[PDB]
């Protein structure tokens, strides 16, 4: 994704995408260890996107 499209999501849906992102991220790491992926750069991108969702969800509650 990208930061602009993440904030467009509503609060109920953002948590739905979060668990989907964490679930798919563990499979990719397992998949990468079994046999290297075509694009290793998707591991960093997925991991740093999860930190973006946790940041915005925190902002909604905190602010």
């Amino acid at each position: 994704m990208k930061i602009a499209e993440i904030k467009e999501l509503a609060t109920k849906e953002l948590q739905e995408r979060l668990d989907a992102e964490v679930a798919a991220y563990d499979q990719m790491r397992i998949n990468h260890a079994v046999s290297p992926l075509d694009s290793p750069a998707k591991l960093k991108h997925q991991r740093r996107m999860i930190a973006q969702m946790k940041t915005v969800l925190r902002q909604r509650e905190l602010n």
Binding site: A23, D26, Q27, R29, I30, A33, V34, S35
Partner: protein, 92 residues
């Protein structure tokens, strides 16, 4: 992040070739057996029947420069998982 990676080694391939329900993963060193059974069952959607564990400290890798620059690999835990008799798992 319980499961780190599966184990593909000569010993484990032979173990699976005898017990078709027997698999082995690397997991976080501080996870207990109850948690590990939950993770392997919430990700591969199977019936785990038994889990055995062992803790490995990392191998020391002492290099030399002007001497004795110590190094070490991270510690890990090994989980040997037995599925319900008649179930399998595909690492591809």
């Amino acid at each position: 992040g319980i499961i780190i990676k599966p184990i593909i080694s000569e010993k484990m391939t032979a173990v699976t070739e005898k017990m078709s329900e027997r698999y082995g993963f690397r997991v976080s060193p501080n996870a207990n057996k109850i948690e590990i059974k939950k993770a392997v069952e919430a990700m591969y959607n199977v019936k785990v029947e038994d889990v055995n564990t062992m803790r490995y400290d990392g191998k020391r890798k002492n290099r030399y420069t002007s001497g004795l620059i110590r190094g070490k690999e991270a510690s890990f835990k090994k989980a040997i998982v037995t599925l319900k008799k008649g179930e399998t798992i595909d690492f591809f």
